[PDB]
Amino acid sequence: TVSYSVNKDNGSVTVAGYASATDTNKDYAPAIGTAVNVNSAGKITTETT
Amino acid sequence: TVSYSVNKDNGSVTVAGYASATDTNKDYAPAIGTAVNVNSAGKITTETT
């Protein structure tokens, strides 16, 4: 589970942290405040290119 | 009372909905679906001149 914040003015989506049932040791931790991008296949991915 | 619809995809604000406690003959009712802008003085206004 990861939380996305949508800017009301810009319309962009950013990662605003995440919560997991287990500890997860922050292994799957994505960077907070990074712009959210749509992959070519249509998934959600932080990679620009 | 003027009702504005906000498109959450990009943040654009349009005019959609007019309410009047009197008949008002729709004197102050702009056509719905017109993109609203901000005047020089910061007011909320429809013309782009």
From TrEMBL, chains A, B:
Compartments, record wording: Secreted; Bacterial flagellum
Coiled coil: none
Transmembrane intervals: none
Function of the molecule: Flagellin is the subunit protein which polymerizes to form the filaments of bacterial flagella.
Family to which this protein belongs: Belongs to the bacterial flagellin family.
Listed name of the protein: Flagellin
Species of provenance: Escherichia coli O157:H7
